[PDB]
Amino acid sequence: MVRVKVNDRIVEVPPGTSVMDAVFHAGYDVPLFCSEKHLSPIGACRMCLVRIGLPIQWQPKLAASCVTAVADGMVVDTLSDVVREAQAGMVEFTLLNHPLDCPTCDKGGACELQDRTVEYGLYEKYELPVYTRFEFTRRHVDKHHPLSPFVILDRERCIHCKRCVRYFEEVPGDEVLDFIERGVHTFIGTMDFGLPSGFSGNITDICPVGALLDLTARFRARNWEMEETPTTCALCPVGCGITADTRSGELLRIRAREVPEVNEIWICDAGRFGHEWADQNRLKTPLVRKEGRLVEATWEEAFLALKEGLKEARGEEVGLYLAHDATLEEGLLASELAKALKTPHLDFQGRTAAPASLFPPASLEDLLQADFALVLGDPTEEAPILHLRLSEFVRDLKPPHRYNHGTPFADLQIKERMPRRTDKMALFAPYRAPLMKWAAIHEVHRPGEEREILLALLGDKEGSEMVAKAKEAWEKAKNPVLILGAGVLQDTVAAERARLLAERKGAKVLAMTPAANARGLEAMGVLPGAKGASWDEPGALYAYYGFVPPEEALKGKRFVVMHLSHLHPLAERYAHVVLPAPTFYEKRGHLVNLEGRVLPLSPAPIENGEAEGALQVLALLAEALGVRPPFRLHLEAQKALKARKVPEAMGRLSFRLKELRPKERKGAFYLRPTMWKAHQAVGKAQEAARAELWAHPETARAEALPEGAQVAVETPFGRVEARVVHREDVPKGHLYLSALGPAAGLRVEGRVLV
Amino acid sequence: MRLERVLEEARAKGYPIEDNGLGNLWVVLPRERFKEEMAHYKAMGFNFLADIVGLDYLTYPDPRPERFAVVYELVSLPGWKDGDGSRFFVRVYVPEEDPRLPTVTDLWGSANFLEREVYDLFGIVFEGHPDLRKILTPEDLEGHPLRKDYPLGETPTLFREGRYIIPAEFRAALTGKDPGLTFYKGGSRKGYRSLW
Amino acid sequence: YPDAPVALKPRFHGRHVLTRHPNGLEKCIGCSLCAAACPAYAIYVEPAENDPENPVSAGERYAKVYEINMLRCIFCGLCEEACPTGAIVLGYDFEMADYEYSDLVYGKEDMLVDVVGTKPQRREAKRTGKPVKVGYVVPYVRPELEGFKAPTEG
Amino acid sequence: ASSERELYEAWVELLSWMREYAQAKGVRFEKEADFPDFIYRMERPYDLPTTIMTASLSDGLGEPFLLADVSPRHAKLKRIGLRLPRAHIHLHAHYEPGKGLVTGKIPLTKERFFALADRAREALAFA
Amino acid sequence: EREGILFTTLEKLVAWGRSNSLWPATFGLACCAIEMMASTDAQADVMIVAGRLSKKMAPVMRRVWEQMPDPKWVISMGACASSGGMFNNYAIVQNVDSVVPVDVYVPGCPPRPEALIYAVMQLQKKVRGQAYNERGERLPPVAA
Numbered sequence A: 001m002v003r004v005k006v007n008d009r010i011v012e013v014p015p016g017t018s019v020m021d022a023v024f025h026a027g028y029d030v031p032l033f034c035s036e037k038h039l040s041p042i043g044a045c046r047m048c049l050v051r052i053g054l055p056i057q058w059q060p061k062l063a064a065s066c067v068t069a070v071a072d073g074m075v076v077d078t079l080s081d082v083v084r085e086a087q088a089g090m091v092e093f094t095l096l097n098h099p100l101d102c103p104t105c106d107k108g109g110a111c112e113l114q115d116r117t118v119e120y121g122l123y124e125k126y127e128l129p130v131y132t133r134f135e136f137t138r139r140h141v142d143k144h145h146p147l148s149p150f151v152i153l154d155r156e157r158c159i160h161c162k163r164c165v166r167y168f169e170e171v172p173g174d175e176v177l178d179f180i181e182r183g184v185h186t187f188i189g190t191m192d193f194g195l196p197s198g199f200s201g202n203i204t205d206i207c208p209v210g211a212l213l214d215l216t217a218r219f220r221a222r223n224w225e226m227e228e229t230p231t232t233c234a235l236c237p238v239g240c241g242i243t244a245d246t247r248s249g250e251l252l253r254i255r256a257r258e259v260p261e262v263n264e265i266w267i268c269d270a271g272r273f274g275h276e277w278a279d280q281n282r283l284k285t286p287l288v289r290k291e292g293r294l295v296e297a298t299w300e301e302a303f304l305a306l307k308e309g310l311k312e313a314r315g316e317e318v319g320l321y322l323a324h325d326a327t328l329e330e331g332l333l334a335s336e337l338a339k340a341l342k343t344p345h346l347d348f349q350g351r352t353a354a355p356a357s358l359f360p361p362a363s364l365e366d367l368l369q370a371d372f373a374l375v376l377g378d379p380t381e382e383a384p385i386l387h388l389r390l391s392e393f394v395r396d397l398k399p400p401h402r403y404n405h406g407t408p409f410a411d412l413q414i415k416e417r418m419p420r421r422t423d424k425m426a427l428f429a430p431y432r433a434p435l436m437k438w439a440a441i442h443e444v445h446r447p448g449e450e451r452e453i454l455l456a457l458l459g460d461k462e463g464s465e466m467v468a469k470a471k472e473a474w475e476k477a478k479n480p481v482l483i484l485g486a487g488v489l490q491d492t493v494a495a496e497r498a499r500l501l502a503e504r505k506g507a508k509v510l511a512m513t514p515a516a517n518a519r520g521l522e523a524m525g526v527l528p529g530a531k532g533a534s535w536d537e538p539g540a541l542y543a544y545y546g547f548v549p550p551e552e553a554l555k556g557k558r559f560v561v562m563h564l565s566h567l568h569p570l571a572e573r574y575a576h577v578v579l580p581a582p583t584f585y586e587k588r589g590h591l592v593n594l595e596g597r598v599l600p601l602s603p604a605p606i607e608n609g610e611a612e613g614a615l616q617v618l619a620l621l622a623e624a625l626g627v628r629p630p631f632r633l634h635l636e637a638q639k640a641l642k643a644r645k646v647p648e649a650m651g652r653l654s655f656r657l658k659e660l661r662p663k664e665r666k667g668a669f670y671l672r673p674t675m676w677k678a679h680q681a682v683g684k685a686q687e688a689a690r691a692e693l694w695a696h697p698e699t700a701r702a703e704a705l706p707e708g709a710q711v712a713v714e715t716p717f718g719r720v721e722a723r724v725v726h727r728e729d730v731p732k733g734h735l736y737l738s739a740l741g742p743a744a745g746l747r748v749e750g751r752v753l754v
Numbered sequence B: 001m002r003l004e005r006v007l008e009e010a011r012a013k014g015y016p017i018e019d020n021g022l023g024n025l026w027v028v029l030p031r032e033r034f035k036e037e038m039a040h041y042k043a044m045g046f047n048f049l050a051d052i053v054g055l056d057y058l059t060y061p062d063p064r065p066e067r068f069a070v071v072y073e074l075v076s077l078p079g080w081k082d083g084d085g086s087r088f089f090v091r092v093y094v095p096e097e098d099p100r101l102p103t104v105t106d107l108w109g110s111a112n113f114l115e116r117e118v119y120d121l122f123g124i125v126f127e128g129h130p131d132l133r134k135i136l137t138p139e140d141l142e143g144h145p146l147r148k149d150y151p152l153g154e155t156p157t158l159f160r161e162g163r164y165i166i167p168a169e170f171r172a173a174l175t176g177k178d179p180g181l182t183f184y185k186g187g188s189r190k191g192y193r194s195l196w
Numbered sequence C: 001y002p003d004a005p006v007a008l009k010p011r012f013h014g015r016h017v018l019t020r021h022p023n024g025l026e027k028c029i030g031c032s033l034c035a036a037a038c039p040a041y042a043i044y045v046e047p048a049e050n051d052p053e054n055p056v057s058a059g060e061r062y063a064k065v066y067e068i069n070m071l072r073c074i075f076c077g078l079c080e081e082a083c084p085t086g087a088i089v090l091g092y093d094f095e096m097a098d099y100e101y102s103d104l105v106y107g108k109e110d111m112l113v114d115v116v117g118t119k120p121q122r123r124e125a126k127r128t129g130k131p132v133k134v135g136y137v138v139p140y141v142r143p144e145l146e147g148f149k150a151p152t153e154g
Numbered sequence D: 001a002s003s004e005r006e007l008y009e010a011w012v013e014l015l016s017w018m019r020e021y022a023q024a025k026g027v028r029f030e031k032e033a034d035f036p037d038f039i040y041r042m043e044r045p046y047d048l049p050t051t052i053m054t055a056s057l058s059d060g061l062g063e064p065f066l067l068a069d070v071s072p073r074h075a076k077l078k079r080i081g082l083r084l085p086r087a088h089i090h091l092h093a094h095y096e097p098g099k100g101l102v103t104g105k106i107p108l109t110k111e112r113f114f115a116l117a118d119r120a121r122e123a124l125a126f127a
Numbered sequence E: 001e002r003e004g005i006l007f008t009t010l011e012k013l014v015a016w017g018r019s020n021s022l023w024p025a026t027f028g029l030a031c032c033a034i035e036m037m038a039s040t041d042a043q044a045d046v047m048i049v050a051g052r053l054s055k056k057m058a059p060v061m062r063r064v065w066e067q068m069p070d071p072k073w074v075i076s077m078g079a080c081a082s083s084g085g086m087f088n089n090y091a092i093v094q095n096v097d098s099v100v101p102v103d104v105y106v107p108g109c110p111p112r113p114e115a116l117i118y119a120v121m122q123l124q125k126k127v128r129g130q131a132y133n134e135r136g137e138r139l140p141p142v143a144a
């Protein structure tokens, strides 16, 4: 370790440290534009200049601290008149051509420039103070221009900190934004229009100013006027970290909360821009059926009408069915209830053929430290932030040393424009997968056809050249990790062989399950008993539902209770009691990560109407059926988790489970795992969560399916409308349907009506 | 004058002299030596006891000796006997898990009400005060309001259409231990002072 | 002496008025900065995007909702001071007690410059058909209150 | 001089041409920004013929193929400005007494303008 | 005959009566008490609450109110009585209405003497049963 003395304070610090993070670790501080966490540090804005001695021999020019490595016995001056005088000059030069919209700028009080300006600007040289020296025409250009349905660019505001272009190349890897002409005439611009990356929203959080701004939430409130709620996203298994911004019971904005242990400071687009549905159409009063129709009732008229439908009910026809995002608490109760209430009709909306708890959870940090990545499925669609890790991984970037201020602002490790390794990953997905670019060993197969590829990798059959190339690298692999998702976890045959491959070799796994809390709900024993009535198989006769199921699993049943948060058409025609429930943005409880971690879920001040959690509602269904529930409120339910011995927040719960409930898969339609979920198709995310049907140009046109045409598609999961797409990377005869749910990775009988 | 003889003494015996450039100066006595040496001050010629302030440092950015602290202010009125007009503060930190501190009601009469208030609003006991009874807060108030961990208790302000405001979540103002709305704060936002 | 008008000074702190420019646009660009400085948490501002064809104000931003809870307000003018446009400005009306609490949050239409009188005064002059009499006079109307038509024979 | 006044008299006129062309070739005209010296003029006086400082001719996607600005009231070295975005072409029109709106020496007429904007539309326009 | 022209037209008068027979029992606290002694200078029905109502002092105003002739009115003077005012904390009752039914609220801090005049002039049009709310309804002459 190197002995550096910042101002008067001396500090230890590892050799590969920036003079910046040196000075921030010490306590002291400095201006800061272009440089960002997890982005390659450069000296472009030229504000972090400091004075440096390497005796007392002071260097003749000022050094940009963000791109200078600490030498041993170094001295850093950040206070001298020389420094400050410069600092205030760098402020001055920035504001030189800046716009003057502060009051009317969505970049509220949350604006790095504003702030720094008042922190270091307006030097005190020792008569009226001179606010502005520049007195000429400013830089007028393109203003208030939407790049996407989600992003709005203000060219005038841009201060050229290279953050966004820099971010696009490095993190996701989609060069969709870059600078244009040179000199004082340069601006930000695109020729990829759509803003094609599925990680475009993150520029919104990096931009130091208000050029790049989240348009989902233009002109809602000022930054201090938001009621920030630090929680977790439950749209998929990665379980990131967000903060929900509200004001007056409505959902305004989604930003990312920093949580290095999981998603670093990044968030995927469906999670950040798909939130307008929880705002809007909502079930607020419990409905009960009267004249073959539903009408407004009370929890009174409901708790009674509910005793009535369950009075003559046998305690085995009782079916408990949670949603894919049921809190760890909501599941413990559904277990105990279904325990005391002797039944085998207990399932969760996402549950996969093969228990995700089959494979030993690998730390999201282990992926960085691994040697090879064997991947089956599309990490982009199933577990999006994994794409952003594999990016770091592929560059041999390994976990940063932590300083007093946390994650470094200037990691000399991340060099700009790092060359990516094609030899560290293998990819096998039923299409031209996004990341097949960073994997030389890549091949496109047919759906469910992975059960055979897995046999191959073990060593009991021959596979394509690639498959063998892969098997070869996995052998030589010192400490690989195994990433797998849909068809792998949705096919008894394959999944089982998988566990083997990674059981023989001492290697961990990342299971990209179609249920957000799959790994946690399984840990509570929220899987069905030997009977067979599972979340899509109509077996129950009297059952509870915490989501909307396939039409076929409700028919013939005697009593149906739908615990929704919105009124689905299927429910208003087949249900007998509808109870209002909260979105995940407004639930209090815990979750279990795809990597076996446990994350807190906080409740946002949104408009719940007259809704109650499944925590409560379940106990109400417990009375209506005999034995009183062991759980009431959340304060007490927490003791029952502390009794199963599930570690506190941020910890990891080891829990393996050996058993598998298979099922035959009727290959006609493949339900393609996607980032956007289907209930997100509202407002702006209106087209980005529209379904789409893929087919190979021959078979495509061989079954009357034009290029860009809407098309009625019928399925065991319901009747969706979608645009059709020609893709040569798709096997002939098969049709890939955009499965925008936890119904992803399935093979299903279906047709297309005309 | 009479304060010189105070400082020339504290220096000698391990008492820390705290000094802001602005015109006040403290002297922090330990727990025990407080009672007696505080009497020493009255005899020295300190007749007037101007104030007595309670401080809870719980939410203070930099660490301090113990969680609580009380400050006393001593004077020599310049219109009496010989009194020079020496003034200053004397402070003592006080354990959190043991809020007791001997009274000076023996020495100054003003210290009566003043000590009572420091006890109402912070939980600090005074060994031997005529009657440690609540002064300002209503009789049935549970706990001690002026300390950091006791809520201000604010109501959301109300407007039409169910538009409401929560003062807590609204304040653009920062709390010193507060990180700010952007990554970090620095420069004049960590403290500013001009050079007259 | 509700028969002889109260003579108030030009600086007097009355019911807020929201001024317009000559052009007829409102001065307020919905910045919620007034609301920010306010000790009482008495101002609520919802912003909206101007329509270029039919504009409310000169920015790209106007004030969709503007609301002041007078039962919270203290009349400190801290707000008029924070404002970058010269929009919100304390006025002269003081005659403004009323019956239902939530009737004391004024709105944009309640405080524009063109409006003469307070909620009560205008509401009673409604079911009455007798024009509003303001119970005051002033020497002159401030430079700041451009437009505000008030009884100021002086 | 009074040339400052006459400059703005022409700045409105340029705008008029722009709005004409925009409806005549059926393309987007956009107010890009109002003078800050007008939004923040409090009670202060103001007498410029309009309030628009940055104006543009954008296309189908909203990307500008022509830009136009004019120096604020309280600014030094005043000129009006024509810039064709992606093609690095900047222009500086001043105002001569008894001559007109000139670009160094050439009269910037309604004729000459339309040429520039048509040339720019055909070429630069993305959609 | 509760709602018959006989009884009706009767109480119309009685009301119009105790309308001009209003005897104000000011209950001043802080700064507002001083502004009103600038309006009174130039067995009671109708009490005026002027200032910050403390939580310790709250139960006191209750007794004073209760023991009172039965036809009565409460005026809520200034910002601290009308709601918590600018003191949104523990110490202070957020709206005197929290304790006693208010008939008229008067904004200001402290409201000008002549405001408090309009305040009672309004309380008049109210006990006459001649005052309406912004919703266009007719207000009950007394809170109870």
Ligand code: SF4
Pocket: A098, A099, A100, A101, A102, A103, A105, A106, A107, A108, A111, A113, A114, A157, A209, A210, A211
């Ligand atoms: S980007 Fe920052 S400095 Fe520029 S107008 Fe917006 S808030 Fe102000």
Ligand code: SF4
Pocket: A157, A158, A159, A160, A161, A162, A163, A164, A165, A188, A206, A207, A208, A209, A211, A212
């Ligand atoms: S648009 Fe934002 S992130 Fe992109 S370079 Fe400009 S200021 Fe930096």
Ligand code: SF4
Pocket: A233, A234, A235, A236, A237, A238, A239, A240, A241, A263, A267, A268, A269, A270, A271, A272, A383, A384, A385
């Ligand atoms: S990756 Fe998953 S957890 Fe993270 S923001 Fe996107 S959908 Fe949500």
Ligand code: SF4
Pocket: C037, C038, C039, C040, C041, C042, C043, C068, C072, C073, C074, C075, C076, C077, C078, C079, C080
């Ligand atoms: S006068 Fe004072 S209390 Fe009233 S809105 Fe203005 S700033 Fe707030």
Ligand code: SF4
Pocket: C027, C028, C029, C030, C031, C032, C033, C034, C035, C045, C063, C082, C083, C084, C085, C086, C087, C088
């Ligand atoms: S400070 Fe002025 S311009 Fe800003 S919102 Fe308030 S009144 Fe409108």
Ligand code: SF4
Pocket: E030, E031, E032, E050, E051, E052, E078, E079, E080, E081, E085, E108, E109, E110, E111
């Ligand atoms: S409303 Fe104002 S004048 Fe009246 S008591 Fe409260 S602070 Fe004093």
Ligand code: FES
Pocket: A031, A032, A033, A034, A035, A042, A043, A044, A045, A046, A047, A048, A049, A064, A065, A066, A067
């Ligand atoms: S030069 Fe921009 S932060 Fe170092």
Ligand SMILES: [Ca+2]
Pocket: A142, A143, A144, A145, D030, D058, D062, D063, D064
């Ligand atoms: Ca545009």
Ligand SMILES: [Mg+2]
Pocket: A143, A144, A145, A146
């Ligand atoms: Mg626009």
Ligand SMILES: [Mg+2]
Pocket: A250, A251, A252, A276, A279
């Ligand atoms: Mg919304």
Ligand SMILES: [Mg+2]
Pocket: B123, B143
């Ligand atoms: Mg106590």
